[PDB]
Amino acid sequence: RDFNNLTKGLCTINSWHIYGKDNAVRIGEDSDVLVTREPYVSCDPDECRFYALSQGTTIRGKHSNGTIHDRSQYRALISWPLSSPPTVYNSRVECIGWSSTSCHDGKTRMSICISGPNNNASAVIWYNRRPVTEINTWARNILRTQESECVCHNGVCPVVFTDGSATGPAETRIYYFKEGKILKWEPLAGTAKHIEECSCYGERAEITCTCRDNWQGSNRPVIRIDPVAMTHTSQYICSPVLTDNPRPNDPTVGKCNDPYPGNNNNGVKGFSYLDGVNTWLGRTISIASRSGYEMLKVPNALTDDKSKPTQGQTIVLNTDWSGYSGSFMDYWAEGECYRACFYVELIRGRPKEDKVWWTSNSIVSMCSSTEFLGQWDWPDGAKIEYFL
Amino acid sequence: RDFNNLTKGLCTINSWHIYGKDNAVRIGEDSDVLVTREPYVSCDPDECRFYALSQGTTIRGKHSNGTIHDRSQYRALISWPLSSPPTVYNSRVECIGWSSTSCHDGKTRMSICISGPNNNASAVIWYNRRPVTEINTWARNILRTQESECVCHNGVCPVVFTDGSATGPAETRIYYFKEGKILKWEPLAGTAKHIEECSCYGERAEITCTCRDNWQGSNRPVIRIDPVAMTHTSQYICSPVLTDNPRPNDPTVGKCNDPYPGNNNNGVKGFSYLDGVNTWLGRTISIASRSGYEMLKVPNALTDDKSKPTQGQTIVLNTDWSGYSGSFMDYWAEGECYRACFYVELIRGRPKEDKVWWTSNSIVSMCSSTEFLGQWDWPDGAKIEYFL
Amino acid sequence: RDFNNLTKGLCTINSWHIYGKDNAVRIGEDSDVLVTREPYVSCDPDECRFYALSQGTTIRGKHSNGTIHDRSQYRALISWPLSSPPTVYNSRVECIGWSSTSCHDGKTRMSICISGPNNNASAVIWYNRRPVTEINTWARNILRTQESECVCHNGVCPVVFTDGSATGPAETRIYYFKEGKILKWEPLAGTAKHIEECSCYGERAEITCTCRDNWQGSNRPVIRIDPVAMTHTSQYICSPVLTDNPRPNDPTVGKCNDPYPGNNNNGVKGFSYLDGVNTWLGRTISIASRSGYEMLKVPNALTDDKSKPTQGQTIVLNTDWSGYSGSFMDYWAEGECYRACFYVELIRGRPKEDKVWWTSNSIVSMCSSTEFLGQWDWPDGAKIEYFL
Amino acid sequence: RDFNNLTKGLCTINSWHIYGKDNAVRIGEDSDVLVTREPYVSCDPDECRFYALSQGTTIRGKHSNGTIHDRSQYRALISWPLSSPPTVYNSRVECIGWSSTSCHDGKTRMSICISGPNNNASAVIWYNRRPVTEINTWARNILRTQESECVCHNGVCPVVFTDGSATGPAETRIYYFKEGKILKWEPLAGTAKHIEECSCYGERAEITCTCRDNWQGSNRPVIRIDPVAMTHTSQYICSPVLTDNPRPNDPTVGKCNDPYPGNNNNGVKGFSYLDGVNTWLGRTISIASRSGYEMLKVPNALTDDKSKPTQGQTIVLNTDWSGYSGSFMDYWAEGECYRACFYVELIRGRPKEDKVWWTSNSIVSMCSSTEFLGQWDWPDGAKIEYFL
Ligand SMILES: *[C@@H]1O[C@H](CO)[C@@H](O[C@@H]2O[C@H](CO)[C@@H](O[C@@H]3O[C@H](CO[C@H]4O[C@H](CO)[C@@H](O)[C@H](O)[C@@H]4O)[C@@H](O)[C@H](O[C@H]4O[C@H](CO)[C@@H](O)[C@H](O)[C@@H]4O[C@H]4O[C@H](CO)[C@@H](O)[C@H](O)[C@@H]4O[C@H]4O[C@H](CO)[C@@H](O)[C@H](O)[C@@H]4O)[C@@H]3O)[C@H](O)[C@H]2NC(C)=O)[C@H](O)[C@H]1NC(C)=O
Ligand SMILES: *[C@@H]1O[C@H](CO)[C@@H](O[C@@H]2O[C@H](CO)[C@@H](O[C@@H]3O[C@H](CO[C@H]4O[C@H](CO)[C@@H](O)[C@H](O)[C@@H]4O)[C@@H](O)[C@H](O[C@H]4O[C@H](CO)[C@@H](O)[C@H](O)[C@@H]4O[C@H]4O[C@H](CO)[C@@H](O)[C@H](O)[C@@H]4O[C@H]4O[C@H](CO)[C@@H](O)[C@H](O)[C@@H]4O)[C@@H]3O)[C@H](O)[C@H]2NC(C)=O)[C@H](O)[C@H]1NC(C)=O
Ligand SMILES: *[C@@H]1O[C@H](CO)[C@@H](O[C@@H]2O[C@H](CO)[C@@H](O[C@@H]3O[C@H](CO[C@H]4O[C@H](CO)[C@@H](O)[C@H](O)[C@@H]4O)[C@@H](O)[C@H](O[C@H]4O[C@H](CO)[C@@H](O)[C@H](O)[C@@H]4O[C@H]4O[C@H](CO)[C@@H](O)[C@H](O)[C@@H]4O[C@H]4O[C@H](CO)[C@@H](O)[C@H](O)[C@@H]4O)[C@@H]3O)[C@H](O)[C@H]2NC(C)=O)[C@H](O)[C@H]1NC(C)=O
Ligand SMILES: *[C@@H]1O[C@H](CO)[C@@H](O[C@@H]2O[C@H](CO)[C@@H](O[C@@H]3O[C@H](CO[C@H]4O[C@H](CO)[C@@H](O)[C@H](O)[C@@H]4O)[C@@H](O)[C@H](O[C@H]4O[C@H](CO)[C@@H](O)[C@H](O)[C@@H]4O[C@H]4O[C@H](CO)[C@@H](O)[C@H](O)[C@@H]4O[C@H]4O[C@H](CO)[C@@H](O)[C@H](O)[C@@H]4O)[C@@H]3O)[C@H](O)[C@H]2NC(C)=O)[C@H](O)[C@H]1NC(C)=O
Ligand SMILES: *[C@@H]1O[C@H](CO)[C@@H](O[C@@H]2O[C@H](CO)[C@@H](O)[C@H](O)[C@H]2NC(C)=O)[C@H](O)[C@H]1NC(C)=O
Ligand SMILES: *[C@@H]1O[C@H](CO)[C@@H](O[C@@H]2O[C@H](CO)[C@@H](O)[C@H](O)[C@H]2NC(C)=O)[C@H](O)[C@H]1NC(C)=O
Ligand SMILES: CCC(CC)O[C@@H]1C=C(C(=O)O)C[C@H](N)[C@H]1NC(C)=O
Ligand SMILES: CCC(CC)O[C@@H]1C=C(C(=O)O)C[C@H](N)[C@H]1NC(C)=O
Ligand SMILES: CCC(CC)O[C@@H]1C=C(C(=O)O)C[C@H](N)[C@H]1NC(C)=O
Ligand SMILES: CCC(CC)O[C@@H]1C=C(C(=O)O)C[C@H](N)[C@H]1NC(C)=O
Ligand SMILES: *[C@@H]1O[C@H](CO)[C@@H](O)[C@H](O)[C@H]1NC(C)=O
Ligand SMILES: [Ca+2]
Ligand SMILES: [Ca+2]
Ligand SMILES: [Ca+2]
Ligand SMILES: [Ca+2]
Ligand SMILES: [Ca+2]
Helix, strand or coil, rough: CCCCCCCEECCCCEEEEEEEECHHHHHHHCCEEEEEEEEEEEEECCEEEEEEEEEEEEECCHEEECCCCCCCCCCEEEEEEEECCCCCCCCEEEEEEEEEEECCCCCCCEEEEECCCCCCCCCEEEECCCCCCCEEECCCCEEECCCCCCECCCCEEEEEEEEEECCCHHHHHHEECCEEEEEEECCCCCCCCCCCCCEEEEEEEEEEECCCCCCCCCCCCCEEEEEECCCCEEEECCCCCCCCCCCCCCCCCCCCCCCCCCCCCCCCCEEEEECCCCCEEECCCCCCEEEEEEEECCCCCCCCCCCCCCCEEEEEEEEEEEEEEEEECCCCCCCCCCEEEEEEEEEECCCCCCCCCCEEEEEEEEEEECCCCCCCCCCCCHHHHCCC | CCCCCCCCCCCCCCCEEEEECHHHHHCCCCCEEEEEEEEEEEEEECCCCEEEEEEEEEEHHHHHCCCCCCCCCCCEEEECCCCCCCCCCCEEEEEECEEEEEEECCCCCCEEEEEEECCCCCCCCCCCCCCEEEECCCCCCCEECCCCCHHHCCCCEEEEEEEEECCCCEEEEEEEEEEEEEEEECCCCCCCCCCCCEEEEEEECCEEEECCCCCCCCCEEEEECCCCCCCEEEEECCCCCCCCCCCCCCCCCCCCCEEEECCCCCCCCCCCCCCCCEEEEEEEECCCCCCEEEEEEECCCCCCCCCEEEEEEEEEEEEECCCEEEEECCCCCCCCCCCCCEEEEEEEEECCCCCCCCCCEEEEEEECCCCCCCCCCCCCCCCHHHHC | CCCCCCCECCCCCEEEEEEEEHHHHHHCCCCCCCEEEEEEEEEECCEEEEEEEEEEECCCCCCCCCCCCCCCCCCCEEECCCCCEEEEECEEEEEECCCEEEECCCCEEEEEEEEECCCCCEEEECCCCEEEEHHHHCCCCCEEEEECCCCCCCCCCEEEEEEECCCCCCEEEEEEECCCEEEEEEEEECCCCCCCCCEEECCCCCCECCCCCCCCCCEEEEEEEECCEEEEEHHHHHHHHCCCCCCCCCCCCCCCCCCCCCCCCCCCCCCCEEEEEEEEEEEECCCCEEEEEEEEEECCCCCCCCCCCCCEEEEEEEECCCCCCCEECCCCCCCCCECCCCEEEEEEECCCCCCCCCCEEEEEEEECCCCCCCCCCCCCCCHHHHHH | CCCCCCCCCCCCEEEEEEEEECCHHHHHHHEEEEHHHHHHHHEEEEEEEEEEEEEEEEECCCHHHCCCCCCCCCCCEEEEEECCEEEEEEEEEEEEEEEEEECCCCCEEEEEEECCCCCEEEEEECCCCCCEEEECCCCCCCCECCCCCCEEEECCCEEEECCCCCCCEEEEEEEEECCCCCEEEEEECCCCCCCCCEEEEECCCCCEEEECCCCCCCEEEEEEEECCCEEEEECEEEECCCCCCCCCCCCCCCCCCCCCCCCCCCCCCCCCCCCCCEEEEECCCCCCEEEEEEEECCCCCCCCCCCCEEEEEEEEEEECCCCCCCEEECCCCCCCCCEEEEEEEEEEECCCCCCCEEEEEEEEEEEEECCCCCCCCCCCCHHHHHHC
């Protein structure tokens, strides 16, 4: 109809209720489920769906052997109905590639897939299910993007890309698209020293992205975008409650404009909702691996370098595998506020469970409640022994 | 369009004709069918569909092992086309949880799923396929609901919940929702001493619920709701024709305001249509187990403590497994009256058939006819030996 | 929109072109295809689909054992997209039963399924996917119907039923339905001595049904219905070109008002287009079994007791299995005439191929062409050896 | 809405970006994927889909044995969602046959399937999913057509057919259809000596077809059609950059009106975009077999007998199997020009990989970009060893 505009502020997050779970690996043990990774969730005005990067094979299929690898010519961005598994028969391919992002602007959806060899990748921007624009690699080193939904405001949908080293300074760009066409792009500015896989959400005409400093920081970089001025800023979450993984143990004081040191060249896609006292951070429980997952209310986390948790909710037990996590919201729901939501990628298989030769995941997602709900843990649920 | 209003009275029930049957277990022996239980049927203005609680695995899948258990993080309310089986590819997830209810109000559908650990469950109310409201456990003991469709009148859709012990007094509440939001709630009142899994239907602006007194009664409690005054009453079916299971043998006189004694701490979801002489009761044939199923016309069953059958129809032979049963009607059919309908859950597997490690079911449903139709029996039809 | 009216006459049939073929048994050897029999084809104003009586199991499933049997509680009328196979995932159940008919009246579709034990069957008439009317058995001996589409004119859709013996005189009725409700019914009149499974089509406000005299005749009985006067007549095809199976060898003169003798208590559903010189008859090639299939132009077959073929087209080789055949037309196509069409049921399995324990079929259908097209043969194509 | 008119010219082709890839053989190793060949891509005003000739069996099914054969009664033209594989459950049958073409005219789609024995084949033209016209074989020797999409202009959709020998002069015809009816047909004229499987596209009210001279030429014949005058011409691509396969090595000067000699009685369906300097030719890399695939910019290839490449892009490595290739464009995209697109059939199985008894393929397709994008290679990706 008309372009959606980020006119509301976030609803108060007093707890998280279960939104969707596909139990993909469990079901896929005996049905035609595609092997995936890098999942996310994204809504259209009339439907919300699960998204992911398929590996172009079923989990039980012999081609599942080797799916720990990230970039092949057999991958594609696919979407399928909420809480269903990604099956060969219900999955819709949005585009071909090994890194992607996608968002609805109110009138139609923009999907971006990047493919190619390491030194010659290219992104192709699809709008209304048609290819519209193409961007060639600018640093010739794995052009890559969000791995979660982008956000739009009055037709403008910014997207963060990175090209170059994942363990050194790199060339990150913020592209402002409208109807799949480039209105403008900027180089990253601010104090964030390295950006990877931004998780974004919008409220009151401002887009907030919590990303991954794969180089030096265990605290997360944050990119705030103004989609009207088409300008942005960058810093890190000030809080000592560190949210990347692997990471050092929490200090008593964090860093606002520098990576918090202790772990180099590694990390995990993650997210947060930075909204004053209504601030919640997600993180794996383990400081060593993609294990467990929790949400912690850390009032003023973004700007208070001594902020510590005031409330919390466990999402996945430390005795269960987790993985990527990101933000999305249903900008087309009824009400006066935007209900914050997120998903956690529950990775199964390699490298942690090497008795099988594949790597895949299932998805669990929650949204906020103004009630103070009791908590449960949501593991993948599959028994690897069954796949042997 | 506009909210549906219960303006008609029931059609005269002279017999029952076959409405739907999915033969799920038979078909699922060699196809991707989800393991389920707690099924029901519910209509939208333009389509009627089967519903159930999936176990997040196929019947032939190795994860089918253990599905006798009720509450796990892998369950979800799913719906699928009438008479089809619940397959991995045609099932639509309505919400995540291990207890549910669902009903269309004329404009859109409300679905409710409850999940969580025993002492910290929470219900989330979805309306128009979006989460709208959340209710936390109030007695910290398996918050649970109908397991069959709710009914709406002018936007108001009451739903009965119970929280606390299943073998003692508990805290039952009647919630009146409108567009997924709570208008009001009451504590249970009347003479029913314990309520579990209410089966409901509406006619002439009154909602009638036949439930399960899991504590002491073998006669069924009944809750009549006024969705306009948003008030209700409760009693038991007076009739000596006892309809819970397990149960004592029928007496010559029943009880109107107390549980009929003889069997404690057990029962089965069941239903009835209480309409003066046009009164029909459903029950398992066996007084000992979920075996067989029949419909008996017991004129004035609700109010006549000596009412006995005047006509009957066998639905399932006592030599075949049955299970849950409940009411639903197509409030959007043509005509001057509401045609009463019901479904019977045909449970296969554990605990009665322990040669297999799973527990599932298929569905059979009938609706009333003003004709006096010949009868047939409708078993599940699967040969367990095939699954060995 | 508006009720369709049979306003056109038939197109000139100069040959038959291929319309649809699902290769169900071939494909089903390694995919989830339901076991069926008694198929047909029927169109809606915007789509034409395949129909059949499912056996409630896949062909490879263990429950396929025993599907030679006709009437069980696991059967249902299902429809699915033209030329696709009847799979567990794309088949739509129209109603539950072991005998059926179905037709679109222009506004919506009426489907009829009969179920029950031999002495207590009942038909339930569905209209707009809702049960509307029910008819109880009148002779208490396998109430049964067409097994192919009915035809409508200005809302009136006649359907022929038979109840009683299949090897003696029986009680056949012509029901005139409108919006699923009974407007009127008649007992069969005319000279046809026994009616079974009528194949019908309409043109210029007249409905012609070619049926099966299972009792004594090897020539086919014909029922012509006036859907406006709601009256009918009956006779046999006069032609010596006999079209039932099994049958005697063709004589030089046929019978117009009596069964042509030679074979008792057996037959096969078949059809014909009786239109003066534009008259074509279908029949199995073998006079002994459901083997092969051909179309023969026999000008004035209905009224000329010495009519013999003037042209022909082989549909299936005598070295391939055939079975049921019936008529249907797309009353909603463009043009000035109705293009005659038909399907042939290609039965595989029992009783002729008893190395397997199942019985199923695939479908092939042709429509007429005013061109004189070359011919090909269309067998089922599956290798039974593969199923062993 | 209204008939589409070829009002735009081609976009400038500076490179090719990835459009779709179904990874059919990979996925089909463990899921219900139909065996196919002769694929293509074609768009409707609101969706673009993959098309192919199914073999009426899954790849893993036992009936896959023997699918190297071209013409059987089990084949059919099927279409399915872009980038999905052709599965038993998502494939839509357009018509029955072993040679086909299909195109949308703006209002609806015309699909053509030819079937029959070698000496008695017939084409049936479907429009709006209904059979409308039929054409009988005129040379009684495998009537056959494009195997890729046709193109329409103001309702007129020309289609090229050939009937007669594939290794000698034959009878090629250009049919001009409108709403599935024949407006006119011509015999082939011009200097092309033999035509097979034309690949077509339209721009500025002109339709260009690049075909296959299976008889003598290794250069490709070209048929340019005027859909308004309903007239055409024919010649060969002048360029020495030979594009059929098998073929001699490139000379320094090509032939404009005669086949370039060196290889007889063989070839492969291929295509090109002939647009002055904006001219790109596709060809297998190997001159000996259907191996590898590349795109070469050969300015003025059609008219310059000494034209050689000025730029290029590899699509498939010479160490990977390729096959058929053809043109299609989304005539309903936004913008001022038509974005040229093409697909390459990646054949797996027989005859090159005879360890398996089947022959099938997967599809990869690209569209043009005005950017100068980096290149990647796109192989089928399946490991034959897995199928053993
Ligand atoms: C039914 O449901 C309800 C609703 O969920 C249940 O009630 C909830 O209970 C939750 C668990 O108790 C509770 O969550 C905790 O909240 C704490 C904050 O609340 C307390 O402090 C505030 C502030 O003073 C008070 O207002 C409040 O009244 C409380 O006293 C959090 O602080 C907790 O998080 C910390 O602990 C967990 C382990 O429990 C860690 O995993 C987590 O990371 C936090 O601790 C680490 O990080 C901090 C900060 O740097 C460090 O100080 C600390 O040492 C830990 O650091 C180590 O561990 C991390 C992670 O491994 C590592 O990185 C680091 O290097 C160190 O190794 C926790 O979130 C809910 O708030 C509460 N909800 C509500 C509404 O009440 C109820 O129990 C359920 N009922 C039943 C019967 O089960
Ligand atoms: C073709 O189709 C038609 C249509 O269906 C068939 O005709 C139907 O036939 C049915 C079976 O006969 C019949 O159903 C019965 O109706 C009885 C009522 O009718 C009779 O009584 C009335 C009232 O006086 C008369 O008007 C009428 O004319 C008849 O005479 C019911 O009473 C029957 O139910 C009881 O019996 C069945 C077993 O048949 C039990 O399973 C059932 O639970 C009922 O009996 C128990 O409960 C009562 C009440 O407390 C006790 O008194 C009794 O002792 C039993 O109690 C024990 O069993 C229960 C359950 O196990 C247990 O809990 C308890 O503790 C005790 O152990 C029955 O419903 C249809 O009405 C009739 N339909 C029509 C339209 O005619 C026709 O036969 C078919 N044709 C052919 C050829 O097959
Ligand atoms: C390319 O395609 C075209 C288009 O299809 C092919 O041309 C077609 O060729 C068909 C086969 O030849 C042909 O079909 C036949 O037509 C005959 C009628 O035509 C002839 O007679 C008329 C009338 O005089 C002449 O006008 C005309 O010019 C011809 O001379 C039919 O009569 C044929 O049917 C009979 O034969 C077949 C076997 O071929 C039987 O299976 C069939 O049942 C008919 O014969 C039985 O029944 C009759 C009637 O009672 C008996 O008299 C006879 O004895 C047989 O009875 C026995 O068999 C039956 C069945 O088993 C049994 O019940 C009974 O008891 C006895 O045992 C046949 O239909 C097409 O018309 C013709 N089409 C066109 C447009 O030309 C062309 O060949 C193809 N090209 C190539 C190169 O292959
Ligand atoms: C990142 O991505 C970019 C974008 O793709 C990459 O850059 C591209 O690099 C491509 C490969 O180098 C390049 O493709 C080539 O372009 C040549 C034309 O360019 C050159 O000549 C022009 C004209 O003078 C100059 O303007 C220009 O500046 C260049 O100097 C083509 O000519 C190439 O095609 C020929 O070679 C390939 C092998 O490379 C053959 O397979 C192909 O068939 C062509 O050669 C055969 O045919 C010709 C013509 O008859 C014969 O002369 C020749 O002998 C060969 O004939 C034999 O082989 C054929 C096929 O087997 C057989 O039939 C015959 O009988 C003989 O046996 C080639 O297309 C892109 O244009 C370039 N793109 C861009 C934008 O720059 C970049 O490298 C990537 N980065 C990294 C780091 O990898
Ligand atoms: C069910 O009852 C309510 C009345 O209580 C009907 O609501 C009225 O509908 C018309 C058109 O929607 C409005 O102009 C009235 O104000 C509506 N409501 C109220 C609450 O007064 C409703 O239309 C009835 N439903 C149906 C199907 O007829
Ligand atoms: C088929 O015939 C009936 C007439 O018998 C047509 O019905 C008339 O349609 C118009 C518009 O629907 C009404 O105003 C007339 O009163 C209708 N009916 C009768 C029964 O008189 C019907 O429209 C015809 N069908 C079609 C497709 O033209
Ligand atoms: C390539 C660098 C990038 C960010 C560190 O790495 C990612 C890390 C991954 C990971 O940490 O699991 C998985 C992603 N599939 C991969 N992205 C690509 C494009 O391969
Ligand atoms: C938990 C108490 C409740 C009512 C007695 O028990 C039910 C009995 C069941 C049963 O008797 O079969 C099955 C239901 N799955 C279960 N409900 C839940 C929420 O577990
Ligand atoms: C029952 C008599 C009727 C007509 C002769 O028989 C049919 C014959 C059949 C047959 O000849 O193959 C198959 C049908 N499934 C069957 N109909 C029913 C209802 O069982
Ligand atoms: C029959 C002649 C024709 C053109 C040379 O051959 C084709 C060649 C083929 C090929 O070279 O792979 C495959 C096509 N399936 C076939 N067409 C038909 C109708 O069989
Ligand atoms: C099928 O059923 C028969 C009869 O019940 C049984 O003897 C036979 O062995 C079964 N065959 C198979 C393959 O199950
Ligand atoms: Ca890091
Ligand atoms: Ca009880
Ligand atoms: Ca399988
Ligand atoms: Ca007979
Ligand atoms: Ca050639």
